[PDB]
RNA sequence: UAACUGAACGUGGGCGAAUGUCGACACUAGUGGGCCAUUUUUGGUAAGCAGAACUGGCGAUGCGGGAUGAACCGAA
RNA sequence: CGGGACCGAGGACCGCGCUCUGCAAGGAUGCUGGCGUAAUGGUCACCAGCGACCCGUCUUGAAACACGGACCAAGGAGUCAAGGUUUUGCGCGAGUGUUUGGGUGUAAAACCCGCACGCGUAAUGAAAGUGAACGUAGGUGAGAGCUUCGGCGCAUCAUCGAC
């Protein structure tokens, strides 16, 4: 309850801070450039049918094995020259944090001992990932969200 | 590489069992040349001799990779930096994680590749924008 | 459609011996309800044909039983087979599948004691202070053509 | 049996020199090693050589009368005095045979 | 045995996350900005942003 | 095209003969040191 | 090596980019100088065309769309 | 905050929870009506909408061509012996194999018996011939299991030795 309060006023804060770097940057008379995006989430949109081996193999290893599968992505250089080659199949972008709660509430499954687990309990969250001090439904959002150490 | 003496440095150079040494046939010495092949190729250190080493080649035949030890002289090996990023490195990382454990603080000490830039402000004063066509004006004319 | 394996290993016996399809079913409770991995390697053994169930001499038990391994309790999931080469037989506790008459008889006249698998489950049943030992596998005029 | 066959499962699917008149007879020389020549003793008396109850008597062998013409040595032998008649004999299974205290006895 | 949506199911959503309760009842989707006169846009960046 | 197995220790099979026996008695003479 | 000066190998002690997540045998096969196409490349022709390398598809394969269909698009 | 469609899997309790006398919280119950039979359901025949080339074989990379097919019933094509090889089950195990034969019998069965012999237990060389322990049957690195928690270390693998 603490936890997702302090996350709650976390969001608030960090977006009403970049409005007011934004606007004391306008008002200055500079201008302020925002920080490029840190999370991206790819969906593979185009079909298992004459793709090359090299397209196959990094959308293997992005683990989109079918149409319509979408993964989040840590954004880095190392990552993103594999999604530019792997471009023709997939449409990626930034999201937000409704994107991310809502697919990790609707649609939210975890791997537990190669099995997929639906997010139900916040007992599976943190049996699977109490480690990293991960124990709900919200830390796992925000680690999603704010790309955290785990 | 220039036509006429070979430099003297060539000879000074010590090799030792486990160096990783780079291949390059000097054209000028015909002893110790090894094939058409294994020219420009990669390999450890295996025998030191009076004037040849022995390099561990991995060559290709079929589906298969085959171990292939070449006696080469020092004429047309060369010390490769291949782990030369991997020696600085694993020394810099002792050095800084013993200091680190000494002072408490705990530190990233394993290399990042290359992350997106943060948010950052640039100044308008004296770096007024240029406004500009989709061709140049001075061309046109 | 989705861009993506069954075992290769035994999990029955194939004999139809009823004692031991009983052995199976008293190690299959014992390695389900014991932490021990001795239960599930003895299990794996009983599970295995015979060219994976090389016998093992007393010769052979009297080479192990050394070096601090005299009051072990050794364990052979396969024939335990007499050696004439060997004169004298060390006392020695052995549990096996089978004992070959002379190997018996030679083990009780040493003073030793042969013991069946329920025995050795009886009185250990989490195979503490024993010694599972395993005879030559490429033992055979098959495998040395291959 | 035929029905466990796969043809009913796929019911529906379809140097050196010659020796003239050689005697097999001449070269009947069977070799026993010195690790097997005490299990040729009977067990009991075996048993009772090898647990030391006999010690002013030693066993005599004749190796013919078990189908064997030649002693070979490997393997090694207790310190017990054993006449060993054979025909044939080896260097080394004659030198373990006297270390070992006993005697080869050639015979034909 | 069935799967069920927190975003419509508000008891699963209680059950996953205890604060959403307290954030319907304090509205903390409807926060207002703070409050005090606006400055107005310099005239450089409107000369800019007309700027032929 | 796989990368093959490589030993831990590799032979003195392909090492010149005097380094190899000089080799051979400096094991031996480790071996004597740890068996005292 | 002028030299415990080095060379290997041991004795003891202390301490590392991203993403995703098996090996060896036994026995038994069918196919191993086929067709089409994108890209690259070598020769040419009046025009055709003839070759090589990689990849995809077909032969082995249904479905939706090209009115229809071995080679097209989507999708297995 | 309404309007609509499809679905109701499970079968005492357990659990996570909440707005906590209870509940929308680990899967539908409550009330009511008609009928209680060809009414629901099913089979066959036919109409209607949509879909739908004649099966084999051959060819080659494939299609076409070519070949066979008037119809029906019955028959009709990877079997047995010998010798190898790998694997599965079994008996005995440094041994093993009674059944050439003999004894016996309720008589081609079953039961019993042994000499020889085959294969295995020793290889190598054209042959004459010779013929396998320096060592707890060796050292090193792994290695399941066990351990008094120091280590012992099966199978097996790599390597250096010995006969």
Redesign the pocket.
Same mark, same amino acid.
């Given at each position: 309850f603490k936890r997702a309060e302090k996350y709650v006023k976390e969001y608030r804060e960090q977006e009403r801070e970049k409005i007011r770097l934004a606007r004391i940057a306008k008002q200055q008379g500079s201008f302020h450039i925002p920080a490029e995006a840190k999370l991206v989430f790819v969906i593979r949109?185009? =079909?298992?049918?004459?793709?090359?081996?090299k397209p196959?193999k990094i959308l293997? +290893?992005?683990?989109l094995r079918?149409?319509n599968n979408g993964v989040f /992505?840590?954004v880095?250089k190392? &990552?993103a020259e594999?999604i530019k080659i792997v471009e023709p199949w997939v449409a990626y972008g930034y999201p937000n944090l409704k994107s991310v709660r809502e697919l990790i509430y609707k649609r939210g499954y975890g791997?537990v001992n190669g099995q997929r687990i639906p997010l139900?309990?916040?007992?599976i969250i943190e049996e699977n990932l109490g480690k990293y001090g991960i124990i709900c439904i919200e830390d796992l959002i925000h680690e999603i969200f704010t790309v955290g150490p785990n | 590489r220039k036509h006429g003496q070979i430099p003297l440095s060539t000879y000074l150079r010590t090799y030792? $069992?486990?160096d990783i040494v780079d291949i390059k046939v000097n054209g000028a010495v015909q002893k110790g040349m090894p094939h058409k092949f294994y020219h420009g190729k990669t390999g450890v250190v295996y025998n030191?001799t009076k004037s040849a080493v022995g390099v561990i080649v991995y060559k290709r035949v079929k589906h298969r990779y085959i171990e292939k030890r070449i006696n080469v002289r020092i004429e047309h090996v060369k010390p490769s930096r291949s782990r030369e990023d991997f020696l600085r !490195?694993?020394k810099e990382? #002792?050095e800084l994680?013993?200091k680190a454990?000494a002072e408490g603080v705990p530190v990233q000490?394993?290399?990042?590749?290359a992350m997106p830039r943060e948010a950052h402000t640039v100044s308008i004063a004296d770096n007024k924008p240029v406004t500009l066509a989709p061709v140049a004006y001075e061309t046109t004319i | 459609?989705?861009d993506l $394996?069954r075992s290769?290993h035994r999990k029955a016996?194939?004999?139809?011996?009823v004692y031991?399809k009983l052995l199976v079913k008293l190690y299959r409770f014992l390695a389900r309800r014991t932490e021990?991995?001795?239960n599930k390697?003895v299990l794996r053994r009983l599970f295995?044909?015979?060219?994976?169930r090389?016998?093992?001499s007393l010769?052979?038990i009297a080479?192990?039983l050394?070096? =601090?391994?005299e009051?072990?309790t050794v364990?052979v999931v396969? &024939?335990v087979?007499?050696?004439?080469?060997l004169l004298q037989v060390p006392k020695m506790e052995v549990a096996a599948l %089978?004992?070959?008459?002379? #190997?018996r008889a030679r083990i009780e006249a040493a003073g030793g004691r042969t013991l069946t698998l329920d025995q050795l489950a009886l009185e250990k049943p989490? =195979?503490?202070? &024993?010694? @599972?030992?395993?005879?030559?596998?490429?033992?055979?005029?098959?495998?040395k053509?291959? | 049996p035929?029905r466990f066959?796969?043809?009913?499962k796929?019911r529906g699917h $379809? /140097?050196?020199?010659r020796?003239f008149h050689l005697l097999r007879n001449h070269?009947w %020389?069977?070799?026993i090693?010195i690790?097997?020549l005490w299990?040729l003793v009977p067990s009991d008396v075996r048993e009772q050589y090898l647990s030391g109850q006999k010690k002013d008597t030693a066993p005599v062998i004749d190796l013919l009368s078990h189908?064997y013409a030649?002693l070979?040595?490997?393997? !090694?032998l207790p310190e017990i005095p054993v006449v060993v008649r054979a025909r044939?004999?080896?260097?080394?299974?004659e030198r373990?045979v006297k270390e070992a205290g006993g005697v080869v006895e050639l015979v034909a | /045995?069935?799967k069920?949506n927190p975003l419509r199911?508000?008891?699963?959503m209680?059950?996953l996350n205890?604060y959403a309760?307290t954030f319907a009842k304090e509205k903390l989707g409807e926060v207002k900005a703070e409050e005090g006169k606006p400055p107005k846009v310099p005239a450089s960046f409107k000369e800019l942003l007309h700027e032929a | 095209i796989?990368k093959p197995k490589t030993?831990?220790?590799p032979? @003195?099979?392909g090492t010149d003969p005097k380094?190899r026996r000089?080799?051979?008695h400096?094991?031996h003479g &480790?071996?004597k040191? +740890?068996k005292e």
């Open positions: 949109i185009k =079909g298992i049918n004459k793709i090359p081996p196959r293997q +290893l992005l683990r079918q149409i /992505v840590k880095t190392a &990552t594999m791997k139900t309990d916040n007992a | 030792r $069992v486990g030191v !490195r694993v990382n #002792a994680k013993k454990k000490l394993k290399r990042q590749p | 459609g989705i $394996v290769s016996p194939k004999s139809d011996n031991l021990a991995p001795f390697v295995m044909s015979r060219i994976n090389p016998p093992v010769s052979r080479r192990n050394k070096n =601090g391994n009051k072990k364990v396969a &024939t087979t007499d050696d004439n080469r %089978r004992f070959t008459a002379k #190997a989490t =195979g503490a202070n &024993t010694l @599972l030992l395993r005879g030559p596998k490429n033992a055979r005029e098959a495998v053509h291959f | 035929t066959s796969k043809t009913r796929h $379809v /140097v050196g020199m020796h070269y %020389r069977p070799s090693n690790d097997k299990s189908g030649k070979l040595g490997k393997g !090694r044939y004999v080896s260097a080394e299974a373990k | /045995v069935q069920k199911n508000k008891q699963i209680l059950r205890p309760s | 796989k030993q831990r220790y032979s @003195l099979k380094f000089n080799h051979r400096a094991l &480790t071996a040191a +740890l």
